[PDB]
Amino acid sequence: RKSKGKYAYLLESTMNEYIEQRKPCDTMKVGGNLDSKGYGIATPKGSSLGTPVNLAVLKLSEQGVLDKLKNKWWYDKGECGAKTSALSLSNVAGVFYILVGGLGLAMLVALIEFCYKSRAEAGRKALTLLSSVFAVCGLGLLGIAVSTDYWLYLEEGIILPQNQSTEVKMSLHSGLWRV
Amino acid sequence: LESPYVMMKKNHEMLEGNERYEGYCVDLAAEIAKHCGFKYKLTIVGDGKYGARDADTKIWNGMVGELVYGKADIAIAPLTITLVREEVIDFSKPFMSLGISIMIKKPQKSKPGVFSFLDPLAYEIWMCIVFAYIGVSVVLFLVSRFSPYNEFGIFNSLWFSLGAFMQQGCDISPRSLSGRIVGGVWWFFTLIIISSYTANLAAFLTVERMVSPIESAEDLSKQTEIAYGTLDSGSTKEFFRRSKIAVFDKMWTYMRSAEPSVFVRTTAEGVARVRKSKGKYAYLLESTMNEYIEQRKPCDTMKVGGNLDSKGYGIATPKGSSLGTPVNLAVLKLSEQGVLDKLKNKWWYDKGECGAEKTSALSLSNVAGVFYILVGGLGLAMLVALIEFCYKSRA
Amino acid sequence: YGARDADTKIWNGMVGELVYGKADIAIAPLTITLVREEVIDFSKPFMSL
Amino acid sequence: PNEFGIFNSLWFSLGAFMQQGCDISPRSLSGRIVGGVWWFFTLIIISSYTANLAAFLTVERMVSPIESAEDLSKQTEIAYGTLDSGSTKEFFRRSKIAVFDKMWTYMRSAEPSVFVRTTAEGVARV
């Protein structure tokens, strides 16, 4: 239940079909049986009920009582129930979010273009300042970037399969020339 | 005589003795005679029947009849442990567990549909494409007529988005930031969606993955397409008749009424009707011959699901013998040592036929849907052009 | 369920209670094996597993 | 209600198939259905050419040659063979090794016979 598809417990069939039909519905049974065994009602060695119990079990097999009592305990009193080969709307789903988010962006731009151009019907100073500010900020940001060492983080560790949690062995905040 | 059990060897004419006969119950009888200790003598029953009580004469009818009276001493054969047989002969513990199983035809590819090209995207997506198509063409309309920079009517906004979806741009393009956002995210849509159509179709044609239509008897029970069928006089048909359970009642009322007759007269004919059906007939058989006919040429059949009941085959002796207790302890010895299992891999799975890709070209049947939509779309446009000619010129 | 040990050769459990007189019948998942069939009598299988 | 002669209608549809949009496009809803369903046609056909060619070149790349006896042990589409006398048969016969057990299992029960009588005849069959 915890290993996420890494462990396959080889057990008895009827304990496997029990635990499958048992809350939480987390495990299942694949394939068929590996050997063939059998359960038997068992008498001492020379009992009186050696033959009538033998004829009882065969009579219950043919009437279907042993299957009626099988569907009751393993399956009826069991807290469970009982692939499409195609891309669904969960695979290509952010595409419909970028599309709808692009149409919603466009109509609020059509509101802004309408208000800006209706009041336009009713320069060098800007481009001088916007060129200089975006330059000296761009001079500032790359200047900080080249000198400061936080370009790349690098964590190497080991796996601990209990919880599949990890433990570090190494961690970096490396830079352009500074580990 | 029934395979993979005793069967006459290929040179049965020249040989004589215990060597004319080969099979599972010859190798089994050799192992029973080793652990108990005797010299066996293989004697095929004269009747050729397993055993049943005759109606009012009360004389038995075969291998059960030979053990009761005097004609044999042991029946190492596929003889089912039932109630009416245990009352006269003594069985061992089962050397073989089995039950009613389901035989189908091996699942083939298809017949490719007339809209089989739509398969790489789910029908939830192909509808989302159509309504996002109109929903973009509406937004491209509103944003081009109101808040203009015109040319994008709803006639022309549907046409720009069609060319954008069908990877073939048009002789119109939006000239406003507002209209070019609508164009830009609809272009990103059709890049991903059509790369996802080609990629999933490349996944299809590479990895070929067949599925079984039915995979149990309950999944047989809730359908109407695939027919059932058993033999007309056996323990299989009598099982479904006197059952009461939940599903085999429903699987009887179907088979009782529904015609042409699902019942057959021979196992060999019932296998034929599986192959003479292309996947509408499911012959309900006993588990061991189903695994037999699966592993024989021509390989066309398949067992699905698990067994429907549980019964067993057992070595029988007369009622009171010095063989009865040693044979019973021999079967449980051969079961735990894996002799009964290594003889199972031999005769069903090793001493037999079939084992355990090509990418043919796409046929016209795979893409025949777009040839019908084309000519149907050409016939539709000749209708619209006549309607246009009447409406315009007469008025 | 039942097992003889090599030391004392005494069964422990439901096979032990049938052989050594404590019980009459053992309706349970008592698996039909070889070493048990020599000391008790199993019926036909009521469950194939 | 042209620019579309048959010489220009045969040219609009090359460029619609060969996905290279032409100079002219239909301006009537009558003609914009013929233009529309021809575009959906070529969208499916070219995606089916690209993805069937990708299914060719993947599967021929999966084809791994025989490089062991274990690779022969699984792949029983290439038949084995052994000269029908001598120590090469008697190796696979009395073997108790897992791969060589399955190899003798095929070779003893197969038709037509994998067992050749002579080396020069067995090379001839290869």
Next chain:
Amino acid sequence: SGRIVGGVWWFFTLIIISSYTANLAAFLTVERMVSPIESAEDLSKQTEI
């Protein structure tokens, strides 16, 4: 001057979109190859589970 900027930007997007289509086709093929465990023989080969 401008038809080189137009030219090498076209060769860029020719490679990038062909690399998106064909890596997505390599995703969806390999996840389709993933067959679940259905026997002990399928466990016998696949020793990652």
Next chain:
Amino acid sequence: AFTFAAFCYMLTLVLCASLIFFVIWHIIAFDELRTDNIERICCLLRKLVVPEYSIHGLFCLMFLCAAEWVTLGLNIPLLFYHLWRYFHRPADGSEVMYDAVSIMNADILNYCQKESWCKLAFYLLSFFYYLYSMVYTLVS
């Protein structure tokens, strides 16, 4: 999970927010009519007629195919209202259609005022309703 139903509530939220703008223009046009103009107020309304009655016609086909029979039903009283409003009261036009040839009457103008506040009240009801069933279907 994102399903076809959930996409239909997204796209109708995108479009009914453009329908509330068609009726906020519908209130501001007739309000400036009475305080003060025929051919100006004639034109600017009629071009926003058949866009309004057909985007809502898109909705009625959208929720049909999504098998959302509730939200299909809540737009039915407006649809046959719209169906009567175009077929009956055409008065003449002889162009695209609606709302204006020579209006100037407290009968027709208050009937346009009966529209103006009702269409705003119905569509703002729908925008929070379409947001409700969108968020409902996504997290369920």
Next chain:
Amino acid sequence: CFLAGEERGRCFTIEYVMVNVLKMIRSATPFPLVSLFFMFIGFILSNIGHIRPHRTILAFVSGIFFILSGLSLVVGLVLYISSINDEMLNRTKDAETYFNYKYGWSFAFAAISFLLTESAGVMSVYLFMKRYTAE
């Protein structure tokens, strides 16, 4: 008509007779007959338009029946071949069996006759536009 294997020269008219199916081509069967009917109409209408050139509409309408006859031949030949290919599909796989279908010289004629109606249906439209600008 069986030809080599048990050379049964009895030509089985498939409607009532009796291995292959070969009533798979009954779905395809109407469409060459529908197209031959549309083409034979067009030959009537194009000839009488040449007999009486005082009407022009006889030329263009005969142009439609040629082009409708071609589109009935495509759906003919598509549904013919699509009915073939999914019957060589329903053959149980084997290494001792081979099927080899091969189209013949009457399949080529229905293929060639597609090109001739689309030719004549185009040419009946140019004949209309020259005749309609004449009158």
